Structure formats: structure tokens, C-alpha cells
Amino acid sequence: LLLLSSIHFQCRRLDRSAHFSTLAIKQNPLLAEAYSNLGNVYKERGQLQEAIEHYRHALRLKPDFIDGYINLAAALVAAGDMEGAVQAYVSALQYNPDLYCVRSDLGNLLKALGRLEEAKACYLKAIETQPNFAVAWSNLGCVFNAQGEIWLAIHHFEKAVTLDPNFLDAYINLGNVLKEARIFDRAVAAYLRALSFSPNHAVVHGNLACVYYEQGLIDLAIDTYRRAIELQPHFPDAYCNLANALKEKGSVAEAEDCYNTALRLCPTHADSLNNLANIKREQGNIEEAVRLYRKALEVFPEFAAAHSNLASVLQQQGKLQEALMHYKEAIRISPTFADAYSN
């Protein structure tokens, strides 16, 4: 009568599973597992408060019921009771501290709540329990990464993929940290391994294209940016990034087309406004350059480059005092501009 509740649940025949669990409580209001089997039905229906109450009842009857604490934590996370779920996981680990998957889920919750040092401890203990548990190595990487510790982030992602060579998310995390560290040939390798498992991943294509650009492989960047657009076409940053690579190559006409595409999508795209103004400036259409830098500054008043570039075009027009104001505000915002000017 509880095995039949639990059998129907494995088949997701939830009406029949709830019927069989409700009968086991008409025939014994003290069996812990039947209130849990009922909670599991409510859980799959998205009736979370009902699931929680049934879980809590099962636990008031059998406080050593590990699965009650696990299922309860799930339901409290889904319902936004974050620290309740922390406590449910903590009790489960009191009763079986060898539950390394639980301990990693507990770590993930601790991470989400900004308690990076406790999360770290969870992951480390999970690893001490089960040293080959690649997820925990990867999660710990992500803690190190959020703490600015790039080397330790890399270390833990590489351990993650050595343990599990099919671990897509660990390759992506590894590529992203290598990209931040400017270790570009290793980043490329990690992105290309990710693409081996997920060939159409739009965000990885975007990051890989950026790594190629940082390397000075402009043609390869451009090809990768084009594919990134195909994969995710109606957002302006991907067009502005393509255009920046086109401009670097000297394909000015197509760069201008791409900037204009981004600006139909997003008329206040400040990078596109500035970078298109730069094409205008370089071609000698000073009036249109001025117009666009000024639009960029309306979107982003503290855009140092746009101030600098504006100042340059005003200086050419002989508007020397207005130029000077913008030179000075570029330096106020980003002082290294003064070292660029002097050079």
C-alpha cells in the first residue's frame, strides 16, 4: 500500500500514487514515508506549501528520514525559503555525512546567498568524502573565481575535466576564467572542447570570437562572430562586436552596416554610437561624428572615450574651449587618458 504509492510515483501516475499514499494514512496516520510520497506528488504539481507541510509532518514523525529532508529542501528552494532549506540540508548531513551530493547542493545554496567561505567548506568536505566527484571540483572553481582567485579557479576546473572529460559546463567555466586571465590559447582549447559537446552554443561562440580578436586573429574572429549572430540574431552587442572586428580588418563599409544594424535594434547602444562616430571621424565627416558622440554621451554621460573623441573633432572644428572641457572630463573619468594624450 506504500510500495504501490511509490511504484505509481516512479511511473508519474500521480493521481494513483496519491490515492495509494492517502489509503496508507487512512490505515495508519503514523507511517512517515506516506506523507513524504504525498509531498512528492504535490511537489511535481507545483503545490509547494502543501508539499512542505507534508514533508514537515513526515519529519515530525521520523526525524532520521534523510529523503524527507532532501525533498523538503528542494521544495523550500523552489518556494524561495532559502535558509530553511539550508537547515534541512544541515539535518540531513547530521544523519548521513557521506551524502556528498547533498553537501554539494548545500554548497550551491550557500554560494547563492553570498556565504562563499561556508560554500567552500561544503565543497571541500564533499571532495574529502568522494575525491572523484567532478561537480564539486567545478563548483569550488566557481567560488574561487568569484573571490578573484584565478589560479585556484583554473586548478579546480581542470581537475573537474580530468575527472569527467565530458563535463561541458566545467569546460565553459575553464574557458571563461582563462579568457579573464588572458591565457588565450588555453581558452580557445577549452571553448573548442565545449563546442564539441554543444556545437551551437551561442554564448561560447561569442566568447571564442573575442578570444580570437584578443589574439589578433581578426579573420577567424570575424568568422566566429558571424556564426554567433546566426545563432542568436536579434541582439545588438553581437553586431557591434562583429563590426569592431570588421573595422580592425579595414572592411569599413560592412562595419558601418553592422553598427547600423545594432542601432536599429537598440537606438541607445552607446558602443555602436561611438564606434560608428569613429568611422565618420576617420573618413572626415566631422559633423556626423560630432552628432554621434553627442548621442553616445546622452546615453552614457560618463563615457570617457566618447568625451575624448568628441574633444578631438571639436578641436578640428576650432571649437577649442568646448574641446578642452571634453579633454578634461575624459581625464577626470579615466586618468590614463592624460598618458595616452602625452604619448
Curated annotation (Swiss-Prot):
Where in the body, by tissue, does this protein show up?
A: Highly expressed in pancreas and to a lesser extent in skeletal muscle, heart, brain and placenta. Present in trace amounts in lung and liver.
What outcome follows a substitution of W151E?
Answer: Abolishes homodimerization of the TPR domain. Slightly reduced enzyme activity
Consequence the record notes for mutating S334A:
Reduced autoglycosylation
Q: Which residues are glycosylated?
A: S342
Task: Report the locations given in the UniProt record.
Answer: Nucleus; Cytoplasm
**Post-translational modification remark:** Ubiquitinated by the SCF(FBXO31) complex, leading to its proteasomal degradation.
Query: What does the UniProt record report as the effect of altering A262T in this chain?
Result: In XLID106; uncertain significance
Q: Where are the TPR repeats?
A: 32-65, 66-99, 100-133, 134-167, 168-201, 202-235, 236-269, 270-303, 304-337
Tell me which domain of life the UniProt entry assigns to the organism this sequence originates from: Eukaryota
How does it associate, per the subunit comment? Answer: Monomer; may exist in different oligomerization states in cells. Homotrimer, oligomerizes via TPR repeats 6 and 7. Trimerization is not necessary for activity in vitro, however it increases affinity for UDP-GlcNAc. Component of a THAP1/THAP3-HCFC1-OGT complex. Component of the NSL complex at least composed of MOF/KAT8, KANSL1, KANSL2, KANSL3, MCRS1, PHF20, OGT1/OGT, WDR5 and HCFC1. Found in a complex with KIF5B, RHOT1, RHOT2 and TRAK1. Found in a complex composed of at least SINHCAF, SIN3A, HDAC1, SAP30, RBBP4, OGT and TET1. (Microbial infection) Interacts with human T-cell leukemia virus 1/HTLV-1 protein Tax; this interaction increases Tax interacting partner CREB1 O-GlcNAcylation.
In the UniProt entry, the disease listed is: Regulation of OGT activity and altered O-GlcNAcylations are implicated in diabetes and Alzheimer disease. O-GlcNAcylation of AKT1 affects insulin signaling and, possibly diabetes. Reduced O-GlcNAcylations and resulting increased phosphorylations of MAPT/TAU are observed in Alzheimer disease (AD) brain cerebrum.
Record comment regarding domains: The TPR repeat domain is required for substrate binding and oligomerization.
What family is this protein classified in? Belongs to the glycosyltransferase 41 family. O-GlcNAc transferase subfamily.
Summarizing the function annotation, the protein's role is: Catalyzes the transfer of a single N-acetylglucosamine from UDP-GlcNAc to a serine or threonine residue in cytoplasmic and nuclear proteins resulting in their modification with a beta-linked N-acetylglucosamine (O-GlcNAc). Glycosylates a large and diverse number of proteins including histone H2B, AKT1, AMPK, ATG4B, CAPRIN1, EZH2, FNIP1, GSDMD, KRT7, LMNA, LMNB1, LMNB2, RPTOR, HOXA1, PFKL, KMT2E/MLL5, MAPT/TAU, TET2, RBL2, RET, NOD2 and HCFC1. Can regulate their cellular processes via cross-talk between glycosylation and phosphorylation or by affecting proteolytic processing.
Protein name per Swiss-Prot or TrEMBL: UDP-N-acetylglucosamine--peptide N-acetylglucosaminyltransferase 110 kDa subunit
Tell me what organism the protein belongs to.
Homo sapiens
Tell me what gene encodes this.
Answer: OGT
Residue span relative to the full protein: 58 to 400 of 1046
